[PDB]
UniProtKB/Swiss-Prot annotation, chains A, B, C, D, E, F:
Biotechnology (record note): Artificial BMCs can be made in E.coli by expressing (Hoch_5815, Hoch_5812, Hoch_3341, Hoch_5816, Hoch_4425, Hoch_4426, Hoch_5814) or (BMC-H (Hoch_5815), BMC-P (Hoch_5814), and 3 BMC-T (Hoch_5812, Hoch_5816, Hoch_3341)). Cargo proteins can be targeted to this BMC. Artificial BMCs can be made by duplicating this gene with a 16 residue linker between the copies (making an artificial BMC-T). The shell assembles into balls with holes where the pentameric subunit would be, and can be used as a model to study assembly and permeability.
Protein name: Bacterial microcompartment protein homohexamer
Organism ancestry: Bacteria, Pseudomonadati, Myxococcota, Polyangia, Haliangiales
rRNA-binding in keyword set: no
Disruption phenotype: Absolutely required for BMC formation; when deleted from an artificial operon (Hoch_5815, Hoch_5812, Hoch_3341, Hoch_5816, Hoch_4425, Hoch_4426, Hoch_5814) being expressed in E.coli, no BMC shells are made.
Length: 98, 98, 98, 98, 98, 98
């Protein structure tokens, strides 16, 4: 599975800026955003480990100027159970080559 | 794609005043508002880069008199993945010109 | 469009008292209330500029005795885009004379 | 219209005790409860003005022993627009006598 | 009606530990849990007064070690209006012997 | 019934890292995650008592590096009423062996 990048912000605007910067910096796909209430939202991007690493670093830098960044993290090889149980945009089995 | 303008406020009233001020200040379309819970809401406008910039600065000014503004930001050239994955009122492909 | 009055309270009871006082003080219609989570709720009334001004002032005075008022604001002539994009009870086109 | 009694608590348990105490203290009907997020909930009772006043004071007393009461308020003669626009268990027109 | 026991925790894990300890300590039924947002959740158990009293005391002791307990309370004889209007797992009339 | 493991975090990213670490550390199934609002989320894993214990300690370790962990707890032998009333991924009766 592709690597996993996540930028959590207590602020929609900052999360949007994180997402925009990430997809512009590297070959990663913004698959969606998670809403957990209380003003907390998370931008999720996926791609190769190198791409997700470069995107996440750029997303953090730019979002920090506009909003309240809660967390920034990269998971190079997410477990298949994680992708199946959590909404991260790469449901196992969703593949034409499968 | 149109430029993107956003005023985030922990308060519906302040966001409404922001939104009202933006569409009055320049030729921009208020496409809707995002609810992220915890009292956090974001007014979203779209238009040309010059127009959205003029709108947001007036919106920040107006919202600040009524509420606690959380974030104010403009993205002149938002990435297509962002408009596709996030609800910003400019879904790629939604155009009569095709 | 009719003028717009809004009383935001972090407390349902105080918001209800705001709403009750507003419709009693002047010729304005309580069109509903907006729920943005985190305990935040907003009472929305509409009517002529003078009526909404008198209502909002009475709503603020009484609500302040019972709850936590977040914001109080009046918009005399809300933009048509605001009424169309936001739930303020006067959707443009919803008129028998139209 | 019946008088309106309300006990708002940042805590479900405290609200439940408030509601229980109100309907036990006087001839009032617990019509339901409002959820505004952030842990905020409001118990709503309806009945004659004397009954709701007796209920709320007992409810405040009982809720205070269990939780953090946010607001306590009585509206003897609520405006018809309020009962029509807000969920208080006495929708105008809902009556067999017509 | 059976007695009513409630353990409110600002934390799902602590609420789960409360619920588990309660049903293990005495003859009470965990009927469900109430979600009021802001991280607030409440475990609700019902049974005879003695059983609910023993359960609630054990639920409080164990939950306090794991999470943030907001409120703990027992209602021996909840009013019929409470069980009808609030989701506490004993809707009046839901009985085969009725 | 399988043992129950839980990592609660006020942050989606920290919870995702917890969940990822748990299923990687031991033979446990991430059954899902609970959303209680206010930014609070809980990762839920099921498996043998030894496995879930190994998972949670690794999950706490991993989540703590990324976010603010709210609660960490293991229930070796959860009561059947808990699995029936709460969404923990092991509904009693859901078994081919019957």
């Amino acid at each position: 599975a592709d690597a996993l990048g996540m930028i959590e912000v207590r602020g929609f605007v900052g999360m949007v800026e994180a997402a925009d910067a990430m997809v512009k910096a590297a070959k990663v796909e913004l698959i969606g955003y998670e809403k957990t209430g209380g003003g907390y939202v998370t931008a999720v991007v996926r791609g190769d480990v190198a791409a997700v690493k470069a995107a996440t670093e750029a997303g953090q830098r730019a979002a920090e100027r506009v909003g309240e960044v809660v967390a920034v993290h990269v998971i190079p090889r997410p477990h298949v159970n994680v992708d199946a149980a959590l909404p991260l945009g790469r449901t196992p089995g969703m593949d034409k080559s499968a």
